[PDB]
């Protein structure tokens, strides 16, 4: 009576798209961030030492980050 019929265009398609977008980013938003969290809180990054006396390293063991 007091509240008339407001006329909004449509909302269902837009809310469906944003629901699908947040759900299908949230599907791998939680595990990837949790995995990189577990990496930089458990396995540790690296340490600052040099090449020892007469020794050959690999082409890795040059990089601070372990996933790198």
């Amino acid at each position: 009576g007091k509240r008339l019929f407001i006329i909004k265009p449509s909302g269902f398609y837009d809310k469906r798209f944003l629901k699908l977008l947040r759900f299908y980013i949230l599907l791998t938003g939680i595990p990837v961030v949790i995995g990189i969290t577990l990496i930089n809180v458990f396995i540790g990054e690296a340490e600052l030492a040099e090449i020892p006396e007469g020794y050959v390293p690999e082409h890795w063991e040059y990089f601070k980050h372990p996933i790198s």
Partner: protein, 37 residues
């Protein structure tokens, strides 16, 4: 001058129709919206 009576007749029919439309826009089933959950 003024209206021609054809315009008066036409306009009074549009009075009735436009009042019926705008009253029909006024909803009150005691509940406009309803969430199913």
């Amino acid at each position: 001058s003024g209206y021609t009576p054809d315009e008066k007749l036409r306009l009074q029919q549009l009075r009735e129709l436009r009042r019926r439309w705008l009253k029909d826009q006024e909803l009150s089933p005691r509940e406009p919206v309803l969430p199913p959950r």
